[PDB]
Ligand binder design. Structure first.
Ligand code: HEM
Length: 214
């Protein structure tokens, strides 16, 4: 359509369906991804979010990003730090894995942030809106289909606490995506970054399945 949000949802529809069928996300819902596998996901999110969120911070203030900047509602870095300390312990920072597929993903994020910040909005949409779309049904699959000790920790990533309703927030985020000012050339690229974004996730899933199978 002519609304960026709707353009994004339509384009990335097939790649998105590829992830629905990925071997890793099927076991990750069939409720049987090992505690090892879960921790690799969390570790993956951390590195990604750290990247996404440095570059968002670098580009906040810029017309290409300002309008979709909601730091309090969306930031995930602290939430993942809390979680990783529970999953990996007090020295999580030194022990967490950092694989080729995570770095791939993280590489693109710094590139876009540093040279094509006008595309950063493609990664925000894919990350935030999708994560917000699943942090609910997923968190259950997780916890119940996971452990945990009588913890009270380890699943904070799945709650955006400064967002009372995900629905009301998405709508406002899309709204704000739609008044993003953009050349038709840039817009086509942002669209194509949304696909690249999904692809980076897919390659990440395929890598984590490799590591978790032998
Ligand atoms: C088997 C794997 C997946 C399943 C089963 C799944 C499921 C869903 C479903 C049912 C929705 C509808 C939104 C809603 O519930 O209200 C959704 C939305 C969404 N998904 Fe996924 N998803 C998967 C993988 C992914 C991945 C890997 C990404 C990218 C990292 C992604 C990105 C998004 C985004 C950005 C939205 C909403 C954005 C918008 O409204 O335009 N999905 N997902």
């Amino acid at each position: 359509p002519q609304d960026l949000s709707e353009a994004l949802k339509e384009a990335t529809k097939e790649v998105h369906t590829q992830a629905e069928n990925a071997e890793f996300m099927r076991n990750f819902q069939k409720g049987q991804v090992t505690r090892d596998g879960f921790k690799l996901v969390m570790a993956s999110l951390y590195h990604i979010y750290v990247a996404l969120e440095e570059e968002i911070e670098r580009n906040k203030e810029s017309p290409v990003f300002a309008p979709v900047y909601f730091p309090e509602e969306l930031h995930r870095k602290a939430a993942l730090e809390q979680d990783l300390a529970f999953w990996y312990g007090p020295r999580w920072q030194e022990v967490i894995p950092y694989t080729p597929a995570m770095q791939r993903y993280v590489k693109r994020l710094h590139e876009v942030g540093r040279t094509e910040p006008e595309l950063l909005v493609a990664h925000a949409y894919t990350r935030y809106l999708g994560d917000l779309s699943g942090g609910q049904v997923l968190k259950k699959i997780a916890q119940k289909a996971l452990d945990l000790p009588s913890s009270g920790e380890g699943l904070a990533f799945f709650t955006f606490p400064n967002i009372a309703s995900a629905t009301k927030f998405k709508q406002l985020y899309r709204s704000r995506m739609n008044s993003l000012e953009m050349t038709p050339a840039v817009r086509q690229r942002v669209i194509e970054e949304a696909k690249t974004a999904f692809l980076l996730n897919i390659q990440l899933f395929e890598e984590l399945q490799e590591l978790l199978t032998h």
